[PDB]
Design a protein around this ligand. Structure first.
Ligand SMILES: Cc1c(C)c2c3c4c1OP(=O)(O)Oc1c(C)c(C)c5c(c1C4)Cc1c(c(c(C)c(C)c1OP(=O)(O)O5)OP(=O)(O)O2)C3
Ligand SMILES: Cc1c(C)c2c3c4c1OP(=O)(O)Oc1c(C)c(C)c5c(c1C4)Cc1c(c(c(C)c(C)c1OP(=O)(O)O5)OP(=O)(O)O2)C3
Ligand SMILES: Cc1c(C)c2c3c4c1OP(=O)(O)Oc1c(C)c(C)c5c(c1C4)Cc1c(c(c(C)c(C)c1OP(=O)(O)O5)OP(=O)(O)O2)C3
Ligand SMILES: OC[C@@]1(O)OC[C@@H](O)[C@@H](O)[C@@H]1O
Ligand SMILES: OC[C@@]1(O)OC[C@@H](O)[C@@H](O)[C@@H]1O
Ligand SMILES: OC[C@@]1(O)OC[C@@H](O)[C@@H](O)[C@@H]1O
Ligand SMILES: OC[C@@]1(O)OC[C@@H](O)[C@@H](O)[C@@H]1O
Ligand SMILES: OC[C@@]1(O)OC[C@@H](O)[C@@H](O)[C@@H]1O
Ligand SMILES: OC[C@@]1(O)OC[C@@H](O)[C@@H](O)[C@@H]1O
Ligand SMILES: [Zn+2]
Ligand SMILES: [Zn+2]
Ligand SMILES: [Zn+2]
Lengths: 91, 91, 91
């Protein structure tokens, strides 16, 4: 049957986990920080999703790559809300 | 042509790598621990797969997200067998 | 609509980022090292891609898993060009 597509990242030792789900063209986010799953602020269009993150000290930085057709849009979390990133590709 | 879908994670100083393949609704696992590839114990249903892992000291923790329909099931490896995680996509 | 499929990895604190895109049977690579996106050296066939990476000091080691059909080919970056890895899906 048709199935959603996911991408996952984690950081630290607790850990913090973020799982992105692409469902019928919309990506949403589920979060774990040690006390139960909850819904994240990320909501962007996309059929397909990948993610990577890195720590600067204790500060997390997340990059989500959301693709519709041949266009991939990068979204960035740097502690102060999601912003559109500079990524481009000539697909 | 129709193609399988993979997810990969790695850790530590060997390094240890784990590659999950979703093929026709079934997910399986191939492992590298420095001495050749071999088949892992993970076998769970799923059309799509993502994975993340983290170390706590020397202990690996792996989380594999297996999706069928709109249901994503989280599978947990924490040193002693695969168990179903608490992940849900809604509350 | 049909959409491309991506995978992403990053390392260090700058950070460096690599984003792999599978598009109509071909996987290509875009790169960030703090100073703008550019096209990387990776070009290999595949309908689906996953990736994992690890540092050895400042030196990055990347493993890209490229799938066509039921055949997943591992590509290896160890500082000196992309080479085919030992991964096989069965014994
Ligand atoms: C309950 C059910 C529904 C509502 C279906 C389908 C199936 C189905 O039975 P199920 O027990 O899941 O057996 C299947 C299993 C185990 C796999 C692995 C299948 C399919 C089926 C067959 C084929 C299938 C179907 C699809 C879609 C969109 C895809 C992508 C799709 O390919 P994919 O998931 O790779 O391969 O259509 P749709 O979801 O409307 O209908 C057809
Ligand atoms: C040998 C072979 C088989 C057995 C096929 C197909 C093709 C095929 O020739 P190939 O040399 O691979 O040329 C193609 C290439 C290079 C690409 C990139 C293609 C397709 C083909 C055509 C289209 C195609 C086909 C599919 C399926 C399920 C998909 C998803 C699919 O899309 P996708 O992989 O994005 O695009 O059907 P199926 O596997 O039954 O049959 C049809
Ligand atoms: C412009 C356009 C083209 C050229 C299409 C399709 C659609 C389409 O309109 P759009 O505004 O994108 O509305 C859709 C939206 C928003 C979603 C979420 C859709 C589809 C469509 C419909 C269905 C669809 C279509 C496909 C393919 C290959 C897939 C995988 C596919 O599933 P998926 O992306 O999950 O679901 O065929 P193809 O790209 O040839 O044709 C059909
Ligand atoms: O604390 C939750 C949160 O702020 O964590 C960082 C990002 O995952 C956000 O989308 C998410 O809402
Ligand atoms: O601060 C945001 C940014 O500079 O972070 C590094 C890369 O993800 C860039 O594409 C992105 O615009
Ligand atoms: O040594 C192999 C193994 O035990 O490693 C941890 C997990 O990847 C398991 O599924 C796998 O069988
Ligand atoms: O020990 C298992 C568990 O608590 O680990 C952290 C998260 O992956 C949870 O969903 C999961 O149930
Ligand atoms: O400096 C760019 C580069 O060498 O970085 C390592 C790999 O990502 C290569 O494919 C890529 O061309
Ligand atoms: O050649 C490099 C290599 O040994 O690195 C470890 C694994 O990725 C192997 O499959 C691969 O062949
Ligand atoms: Zn299915
Ligand atoms: Zn194909
Ligand atoms: Zn679409």
């Amino acid at each position: 049957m048709k199935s959603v597509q996911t991408a996952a990242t984690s950081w630290g030792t607790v850990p913090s986990i973020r799982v992105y789900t692409a469902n019928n063209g919309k990506i949403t986010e589920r979060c774990w920080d040690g006390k139960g799953w909850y819904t994240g602020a990320f909501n962007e269009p996309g059929d397909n999703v990948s993610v990577t993150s890195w720590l600067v000290g204790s500060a997390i930085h997340i990059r989500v790559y959301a693709s519709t057709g041949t266009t991939t849009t990068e979204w960035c979390w740097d502690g102060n809300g999601w912003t559109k990133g500079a990524y481009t590709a000539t697909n």
